[PDB]
Write a protein that binds this ligand. Structure first.
Ligand code: HEM
Length: 408
């Protein structure tokens, strides 16, 4: 049964579209394909859905980019749908607007800036090689369970100085953050609340132990950056360390699954990467354009007209980031990975003050992954008649990616 809310008075019938972000029409064909169904040639730039508590969806890249760049008009006070889940959400600094946001982002950047991430290349490579060597000679693997859910998790837990045995419990919490269970807005709100509490419970003892600590791990480093000349308060620290884990452990996992399904179906593209290693390196941003996974929201600060659409204070707008990178008004043949594409502009990492703090780490993990994969498994395909299984929500997911090759 589908839960609908009635449109508010300011939403005209001609803008209503029945779009379920948590179970997109056509999702069985793929997450990106399903979002692309929404972006028809004449669809309005903003449409309103009665599902998921009732909310707007931006359907074109220029709006998505603009909204993310405009915190004074589109606030992060709520960035999840349904609203109940967005009100429960307590992660830092994603829930903050400038100026409150900026010292927290500065603290994170001390740990995640490009120069710091470059130091991690070798550690990341060792992890990738170890995993790949486990199955390269075999001629097959289930890429989800045997690689994409393993590699970024081992990388991040090592970087954070946390035990790899905590991977399962943390992944379960992440799932309920980004794809909360339930079929009513209130149920999904409760699910997110419970997940967010689980993260806080996990991180609290770590924070208490690492304040003033001598560890060189990511958490100690960021935690101990002063905020306006004093130690970071507990409330903020809980949300901050939780967000590191949420971003660090989930997002790259699912990005890799989408990417690899595509590459397994496009051996010509793989061959280009193998023949031209600089094309691989320089082409990673094109992969980010093509395989967006986040669809999150902003809160309309004031009654306004935006792109010819009347918005009321408190309205939520979902920003399906795939609809920027894949917008045919921004990129010709958008579903094609073209490693030499000069304009790769996208909002896979969003825009504006919150533009992904982990983007350098994400890029490095993907680059190293492709390098070490192709070194050992240069050619590969998706098993005949295999059907990956897709999930939509605030972060997309995919499972069942059986790959096959002739061992080299
Ligand atoms: C494929 C990989 C990734 C994608 C697509 C991605 C995407 C995003 C997006 C869209 C945002 C903006 C959220 C918003 O404000 O609405 C964001 C923020 C953030 N991401 Fe990522 N992310 C990725 C990997 C990572 C990694 C590996 C980390 C490491 C912890 C990370 C940490 C963060 C943090 C801390 C923020 C909040 C920044 C702020 O509020 O100023 N992300 N990410």
């Amino acid at each position: 049964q589908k839960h609908r809310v009635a449109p508010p008075p300011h939403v005209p019938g001609h803008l209503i579209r029945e779009i379920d972000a948590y179970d997109l029409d056509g999702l069985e064909q793929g997450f990106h394909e399903a979002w692309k169904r929404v972006q028809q040639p004449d669809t309005p730039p903003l449409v309103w859905t009665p599902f998921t508590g009732g909310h707007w969806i931006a359907t074109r890249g220029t709006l998505i980019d603009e909204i993310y760049r405009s915190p004074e008009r589109f606030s992060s006070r709520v960035i999840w749908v349904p609203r109940e889940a967005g009100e429960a959400y307590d992660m830092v600094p994603t829930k903050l607007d400038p100026p409150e946001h900026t010292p927290y982002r500065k603290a994170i950047d001390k740990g995640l800036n490009l120069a710091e991430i470059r130091k991690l290349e070798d550690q990341i490579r060792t992890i990738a090689v170890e995993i790949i060597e486990g199955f390269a000679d075999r001629g097959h693997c289930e890429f989800g369970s045997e690689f994409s859910t393993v590699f970024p998790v081992r990388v991040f837990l090592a970087l954070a100085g946390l035990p790899v045995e905590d991977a399962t419990k943390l992944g379960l919490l992440a799932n309920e953050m980004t794809r909360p269970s339930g079929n009513t807005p209130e149920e999904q709100g409760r699910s997110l609340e419970a997940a967010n509490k689980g993260f806080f419970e996990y991180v609290a003892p770590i924070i208490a132990a690492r304040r003033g600590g001598s560890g060189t791990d990511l958490i100690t480093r960021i935690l101990n950056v002063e905020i306006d000349g004093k130690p970071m308060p507990d409330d903020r620290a809980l949300g901050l360390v939780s967000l590191l884990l949420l971003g660090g452990l989930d997002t790259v996992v699912n990005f890799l699954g989408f990417m690899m399904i595509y590459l397994s179906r496009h051996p010509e593209t793989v061959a280009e990467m193998r023949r031209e290693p600089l094309k691989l390196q320089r082409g990673v941003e094109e992969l980010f354009r093509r395989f967006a996974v986040v669809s999150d929201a902003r809160y309309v600060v004031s009654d306004m007209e935006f792109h010819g659409t009347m918005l009321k204070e408190g309205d939520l707008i979902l920003l399906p980031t795939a609809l920027h990178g894949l917008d045919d008004r921004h990129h010709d043949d958008p579903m094609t990975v073209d490693l030499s594409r000069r304009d790769v502009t996208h909002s896979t990492f969003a825009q504006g003050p919150h533009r992904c703090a982990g983007m350098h780490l994400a890029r490095l993990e993907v680059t190293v992954m492709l390098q070490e994969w192709l070194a050992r498994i240069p050619e590969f395909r998706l098993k005949d008649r295999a059907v990956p299984i897709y999930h939509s929500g605030i972060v997309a997911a995919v499972e069942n990616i059986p790959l096959e090759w002739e061992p080299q």
